[PDB]
């Protein structure tokens, strides 16, 4: 049923409230998702001024239900199956040798719109680190996202490692521990082990005056 919801282009709305080391901020985003192609196009705006952290560190935080699942893996799409009641996506992200982020997000439909409301708390960041120091490059590497069913919880467990390019030519690691649970009491698809393949491109809007980010993602399922 949830799958029917993604037959075409879907409008997305994103809302994030954050606090990193005491710095409070907010972001609003909007865009379109196309699961058929496994394509997402989003634009985010910091509405509280300048973003206290580098945009790139927020990419993973700012819609796995838009993954293109090939016809044969269709039975492993937990994400769409939870729709429209949606799911809760939680994470802890450990930045190597720096602090971590803790996020909680609800993804669901609110009308014809797919909504992603996030809460983020960041702690232990070093003032001189890559994060607070704004030393990341404005680009993004390609990564695989691993999925494993969690029968007991009736959800999934996810893990992956992000590599952030540093201006000095080094790499900054961000270890992602994630959990997804359904919001509703309906039945969901517990999948077999597989992964999502991501590709991303960051950019700016020449006529946009607020601190912002244009994000493009390509996601495709695999491993079955």
């Amino acid at each position: 049923k949830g799958e029917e919801l993604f037959t075409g282009v879907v409008p997305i709305l994103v809302e994030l409230d954050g606090d990193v080391n005491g710095h409070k901020f907010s972001v609003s985003g909007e865009g379109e998702g196309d699961a058929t192609y496994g394509k997402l196009t989003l634009k985010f705006i910091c509405t509280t001024g300048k973003l206290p952290v580098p945009w790139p560190t927020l990419v993973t935080t700012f819609l796995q239900c838009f993954a293109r699942y090939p016809d044969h893996m269709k039975r492993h799409d937990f994400f769409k199956s939870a729709m429209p009641e949606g799911y809760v996506q939680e994470r802890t992200i450990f930045f190597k040798d720096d602090g971590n982020y803790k996020t909680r997000a609800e993804v669901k439909f609110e009308g014809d719109t797919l909504v992603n409301r996030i809460e983020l708390k960041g702690i232990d960041f070093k003032e001189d680190g890559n994060i607070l120091g704004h030393k990341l490059e404005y680009n993004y590497n390609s990564h695989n996202v691993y999925i494993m069913a969690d029968k007991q919880k009736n959800g999934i467990k996810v893990n992956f490692k992000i590599r952030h390019n540093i201006e000095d030519g080094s790499v900054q690691l961000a270890d992602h521990y994630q959990q997804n649970t359904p919001i509703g009491d309906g039945p969901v698809l517990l999948p077999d082990n597989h992964y999502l393949s991501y590709q991303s491109a960051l950019s700016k809007d020449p006529n946009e005056k607020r601190d912002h980010m244009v994000l493009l993602e390509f996601v495709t399922a695999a491993g079955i």
Side-chain angles (χ1 to χ4, degrees), residues 2 5-6 8-14 16 18-23 25-29 31-38 40-49 51-67 69-70 72-73 76-84 86-95 97-101 103-105 107 109-111 113-118 120 122 125 129-134 136-150 154-156 158-160 162 164-166 168-178 180-184 186-191 193-208 211-224:
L5 249 23
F6 298 85
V9 173
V10 180
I12 298 136
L13 214 120
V14 184
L16 182 148
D19 176 326
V20 179
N21 268 31
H23 304 68
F25 57 98
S26 292
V27 180
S28 274
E32 275 171 355
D34 184 4
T36 292
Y37 286 83
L40 293 105
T41 311
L42 282 335
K43 173 158 121 136
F44 307 88
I45 257 107
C46 177
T47 60
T48 51
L51 194 80
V53 296
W55 282 106
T57 67
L58 298 168
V59 175
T60 56
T61 299
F62 295 135
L63 306 156
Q64 278 153 20
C65 43
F66 282 98
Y69 270 76
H72 64 283
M73 325 201 9
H76 302 279
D77 197 346
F78 157 94
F79 309 104
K80 294 174 203 43
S81 92
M83 291 309 172
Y87 51 82
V88 170
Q89 170 161 310
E90 322 178 277
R91 306 204 174 111
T92 296
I93 307 174
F94 306 83
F95 286 90
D97 292 325
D98 221 315
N100 55 83
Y101 285 171
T103 68
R104 178 170 189 289
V107 6
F109 275 89
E110 277 182 19
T113 293
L114 203 257
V115 180
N116 182 17
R117 312 179 180 290
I118 311 128
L120 178 159
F125 287 90
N130 291 322
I131 320 321
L132 300 182
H134 286 268
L136 301 207
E137 272 175 21
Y138 191 75
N139 59 34
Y140 221 80
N141 294 318
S142 296
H143 312 85
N144 300 142
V145 177
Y146 300 94
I147 305 170
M148 161 164 333
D150 184 328
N154 193 43
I156 56 174
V158 179
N159 183 261
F160 55 105
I162 292 297
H164 289 292
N165 289 345
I166 304 309
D168 73 357
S170 62
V171 161
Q172 159 95 64
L173 254 278
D175 210 352
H176 286 64
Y177 293 84
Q178 164 186 343
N180 294 69
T181 324
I183 286 170
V188 300
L189 259 30
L190 291 201
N193 303 93
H194 69 291
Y195 66 91
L196 303 179
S197 234
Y198 273 83
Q199 275 183 67
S200 307
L202 314 197
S203 104
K204 303 281 185 184
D205 170 356
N207 340 276
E208 168 58 54
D211 199 3
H212 79 281
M213 159 175 77
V214 186
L215 170 64
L216 197 123
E217 287 181 348
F218 280 117
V219 204
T220 177
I224 311 214

